[PDB]
Amino acid sequence: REIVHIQAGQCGNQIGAKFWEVISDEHGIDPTGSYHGDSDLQLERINVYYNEAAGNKYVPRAILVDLEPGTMDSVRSGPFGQIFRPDNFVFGQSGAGNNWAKGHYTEGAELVDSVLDVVRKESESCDCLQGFQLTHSLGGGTGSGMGTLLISKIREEYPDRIMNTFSVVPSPKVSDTVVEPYNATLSVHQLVENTDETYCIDNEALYDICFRTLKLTTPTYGDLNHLVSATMSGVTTCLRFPGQLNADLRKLAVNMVPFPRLHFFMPGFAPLTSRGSQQYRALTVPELTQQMFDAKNMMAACDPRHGRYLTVAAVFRGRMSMKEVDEQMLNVQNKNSSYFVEWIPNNVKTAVCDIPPRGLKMSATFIGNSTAIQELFKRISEQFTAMFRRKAFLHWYTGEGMDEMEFTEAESNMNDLVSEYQQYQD
Amino acid sequence: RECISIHVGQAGVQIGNACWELYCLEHGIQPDGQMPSFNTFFSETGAGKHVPRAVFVDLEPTVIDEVRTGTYRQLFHPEQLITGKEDAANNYARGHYTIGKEIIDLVLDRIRKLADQCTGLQGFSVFHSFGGGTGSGFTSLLMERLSVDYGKKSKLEFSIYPAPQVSTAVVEPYNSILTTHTTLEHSDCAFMVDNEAIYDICRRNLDIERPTYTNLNRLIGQIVSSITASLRFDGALNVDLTEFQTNLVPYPRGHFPLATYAPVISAEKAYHEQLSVAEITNACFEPANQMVKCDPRHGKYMACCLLYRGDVVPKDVNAAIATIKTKRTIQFVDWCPTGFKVGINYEPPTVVPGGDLAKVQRAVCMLSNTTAIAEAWARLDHKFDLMYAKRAFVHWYVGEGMEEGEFSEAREDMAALEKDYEEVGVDS
Amino acid sequence: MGESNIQVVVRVRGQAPNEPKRTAPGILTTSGPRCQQIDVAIEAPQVSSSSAIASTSNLVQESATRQKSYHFDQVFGPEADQGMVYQDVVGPILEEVMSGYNCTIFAYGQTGTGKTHTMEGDLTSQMGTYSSEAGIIPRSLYRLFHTLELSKEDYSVKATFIELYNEELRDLLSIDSSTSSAEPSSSATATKEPQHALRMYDDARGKGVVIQGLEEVALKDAAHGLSVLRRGSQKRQIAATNCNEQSSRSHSVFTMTVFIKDKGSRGEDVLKIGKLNLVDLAGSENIGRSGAENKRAREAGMINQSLLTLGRVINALVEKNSHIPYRESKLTRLLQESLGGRTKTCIIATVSQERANIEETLSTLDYALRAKSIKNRPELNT
Ligand SMILES: CC(=O)O[C@H]1C(=O)[C@@]2(C)[C@H]([C@H](OC(=O)c3ccccc3)[C@]3(O)C[C@H](OC(=O)[C@H](O)[C@@H](NC(=O)c4ccccc4)c4ccccc4)C(C)=C1C3(C)C)[C@]1(OC(C)=O)CO[C@@H]1C[C@@H]2O
Ligand SMILES: Nc1nc2c(ncn2[C@@H]2O[C@H](COP(=O)(O)OP(=O)(O)OP(=O)(O)O)[C@@H](O)[C@H]2O)c(=O)[nH]1
Ligand SMILES: Nc1ncnc2c1ncn2[C@@H]1O[C@H](COP(=O)(O)OP(=O)(O)NP(=O)(O)O)[C@@H](O)[C@H]1O
Ligand SMILES: Nc1nc2c(ncn2[C@@H]2O[C@H](COP(=O)(O)OP(=O)(O)O)[C@@H](O)[C@H]2O)c(=O)[nH]1
Ligand SMILES: [Mg+2]
Ligand SMILES: [Mg+2]
């Protein structure tokens, strides 16, 4: 009944910093950590993310990890920093060089046990372990290196649990670094074999979302991640809140995974309307399901209509009606009956909460899985094919000591992965 | 001389949330137990504030917290509100094996304190689903473990069953095949309701296009009070559960009836209509009022049980009886000579406060039998066979110790079941 | 491209000194439903044929005929000796892999069916066992010091014992003082050394071959200190269920390597190296029957999860479709060298004989039925 949180990297520490901003306002909470919400369903299942203590206090069940000091200090210097309790900033005074072959390798290893103790500070004291939520990068080192060594030890300590993470797919459009096709590249050698699931969020589509379809000018990191933040919260509303057809994360793990390696997924937020389009739009049940077809609301940089969908889950918010919910779902199965696979007749899994977030009246959460999401992978894998031939800027890492055999097999780890969607695509 | 309820699964709970509202509507029972003048589902307290003879099972703490904090928390007893820790997460494997052996010693324990209070127990009924893990694997445990200690009572199943067109999860046919063969191995009598044709009642007999799960189930809830709750009450031709034993089921293993309900009229249509006994019998055989996506015209009628409510005199019935025999478009069987066993009771069905259906003078529940469900059985089997050809969605149950050979065990015997509906019109 | 496809062999349970005193007095004898035959290796189990209103499974028969007569290459019964199985299975190919051919042995079936009696076995009634009769491992280790010595050639006894306990690979030939009762420090120090590389090699010399970290080789002059394989099998993890108390819990992969050199008459030395992947698996536990418990549950399911993934391969081998996913179980990557690969590999199909365990063997009986359409291409080493 409880979920443990981990953050890493310059982004995934910053990304979840926007997330707990929202979950604090999910329940009407003081910036200190006092309760002032009004809904009783807010108060009822506090336990899953929080650790209520004496003095009528609330502790976000979260461990914040970095090798850079001032990043998480800026979280603490910023508001919604005192709502944490400061016995949890496990960090070190050394830069990783934004390197997977250092953060997984040396300067994390003097910080591993200091992390896992705060895990053991929490996870034994938990009533029932249910969630190991991570938020990090695949572009830098701290989001890529240290978390892979976490999962090599956390699953070693918890084989009977569930491993999800929100890892950020690199953008060939917008970036700043160079060895970016290594950090995600060597992450896959540990992300696939030891995590039950992860998603694939890329800025390369995210810029197209806020700028075009939401009528915004400047995509900031505080705003591109605020888009991610609602889609985070929509993953596990039924586990937290009452609903008619409530679904587990493990239920979401069951029906969305046909096969224990093809477990990469994609979010989607349904009332993606602009500021101006409020007074010129009627908001219905097919209005929410309309974006399931939308290429511009698929938050990863792929055409959904390019491949064919394997599995899609729909997690709804609002006092709806199932006959309208089912038959509108039925029509989307009937509208484009080539976009799915054949051997799965019910291509969709429903999920219906009873309470949407405040301000709105309807919301939803798209969770799809298609044979075109590999388009994110062919971009990265082909970039690897150029960096290896000259062995270009190899002389930051061979002094560390990662092998060409790793560069051989993790390379072929990708081709074993990607080329299975096209078995079932065409 | 009593009867016990079992509510398993997130579907199986909210079924009773209407039904026990109706059961407490049977006597004006407020959240205390205010009632004059009846011992079927109830015990009487020292203050006489009656309590249900019902069992709740929920592997999550999710649904029941609504029940035990919202309205009608106090009529139930925390003896009964048996909540659990974790779902099996829609898994027949963990619902039968892993989590299921953590609560079953507490659930069977409440039975020995309630069933022993029954002075000559009539029977008891089980509520579950097919898609839900809770309703699949726990059914595989409970319905065999009851027959270890109750091999000589009645075991009714009002089981919610999926549509061949509208479905809500992937492994829903991948559940029911593993469940139902061992269910038919042990259970006595099983009903099935499809939400497909329930939606058809929403658009054609309710004429409302925004239903709730209450409104799909107060329909199911109004059935049972006419199945059983009036059988305590004295009318003209009262039936009981034991008049279904070798009556309705002409075999050891054929026990699958089909429930319909004839007067389904929204309150606007209470006046472009003048109801009769003969009209509502004509409503009994509409293939668009089967509550399951099925046409009786493709099949036959092995048997048919007419169970009536309110002001019903059989001379008015007997005319409509031979009428349907004469106006037949049914292709009746060879093997049943004439058998139409009759149920006539006295009580009107009561109006759900804030509910849907209309204050009537007379009402019908009907059980019948057909080989048309054997199509709708196999229509789910069409969804079932192709997932095995990929061997897909397979790691959750072999990872929890259920065999591939079970799927060769269950379905081929389930096909043997479906081939044994066809033995009706063979020998003649 | 080769057509050196496969070998399919079958031995069943039977004459094991608890078993025949209750089965053959209880139910029909040595293959009751099954009809053991030896010539064309045909066999066919059935059940009772009743006019069943719910027709039972295995009602496919007629008056006086057999059904699912899965006639194989070579099937055997309780009568087949350890040497008689060695007469047909292992013996006539152990002098063939001396030239450089490679083999792999593994079993599959219902739990407790005697896989480890075939693989490991145990000795016979001797006061001093001079590599006495047991399962398939010491009999080849007895032929080890015969056909690598009576050939009178410079040999190299090379082998390494690796256990695989729930998606790991652990050496049991090690110094293993840390696994026993030793003295750790009262507090933990800093790890001044970098990371450790283990098992994580794949090459592109051929395909399917996987290179491993830290192959602790074993060299013996005779069978005198060959109880290190028993010392290794001692640390192999077992448990005590109720379906079988004797059947193991973990599963192991043991390799063999025969580097033999002789200067041929052509003027060059013959660098011939063989491989005998002596691989044993755990019992496919039906946990509702056996009664596994909390920690035993994850110990039980990953066995079947591995066997599921093992079933996830052979269907795609006979399918002939692109990108057969060998990449879930590490056992499959150890098996992708020959499962669709190049060299030789035999398949052991040990199953049950209970009437209550006829359907439970049909998933194995389907997998042995599909066990012919896997293509390879043979080669040796020079
Ligand atoms: C007039 C007014 O108040 O309007 C709404 C609003 O209309 C719109 C425009 C909002 C607004 O959001 C944005 O403008 C926005 C811009 C970039 C990226 C993300 C959001 C809103 O900020 C979003 C905000 O939504 C919420 O408060 C939800 O509960 C939301 N909460 C937060 O994100 C939040 C976080 C910190 C502080 C306050 C709110 C939520 C949604 C899902 C899951 C959890 C929480 C509200 C009321 C509105 C505005 C102010 C305009 C929209 O977003 C959300 C998340 O609801 C943009 O698409 C929807 C459409 C909404 O109708
Ligand atoms: N008619 C009707 N069917 C329902 C209702 N709620 C759930 N169902 C059906 O029940 C099936 C799932 O069973 P549930 O009871 O919800 O799940 P469960 O038995 O608790 O087991 P889990 O899946 O593990 O949660 C779905 O396919 C639904 O169609 C309902 O309110 N009315
Ligand atoms: N063909 C056979 N010949 C002789 N003994 C056999 C044969 N088949 C089975 N047995 C006996 O069957 C018994 C029970 O099998 P057992 O060896 O304990 O389990 P298992 O199948 O090997 N499982 P595992 O230990 O996990 O590999 C053993 O004591 C064997 O002696
Ligand atoms: N959405 C988002 N992505 C960011 C942000 N900062 C960095 N990234 C992305 O994250 C990747 C770099 O990883 P980062 O966390 O910054 O470095 P690390 O700390 O060494 O792991 C690149 O793909 C950046 O585009 C941010 O604030 N928001
Ligand atoms: Mg459930
Ligand atoms: Mg054995």
Numbering used by the authors:
A (entry chain B): 2 to 44, 47 to 360, 369 to 437
B (entry chain A): 2 to 38, 49 to 439
C (entry chain K): 1 to 382
Paper text:
Kinesins are microtubule (MT)-based ATP-driven motors that have many important roles in eukaryotes. Kinesin-5 motors are important for mitosis in many organisms and, for example, functional disruption of kinesin-5s in fungi and vertebrates prevents formation of the bipolar spindle. As is seen for kinesin-5 in other fungi, Ustilago maydis kinesin-5 localizes to mitotic spindles and contributes to spindle elongation at the start of anaphase. To begin to understand whether Ustilago maydis kinesin-5 is a possible target for novel and specific fungicides, we determined the structures of two different motor domain constructs of this fungal kinesin – with and without its fungal-specific N-terminal extension - bound to MTs using cryo-electron microscopy (cryo-EM).
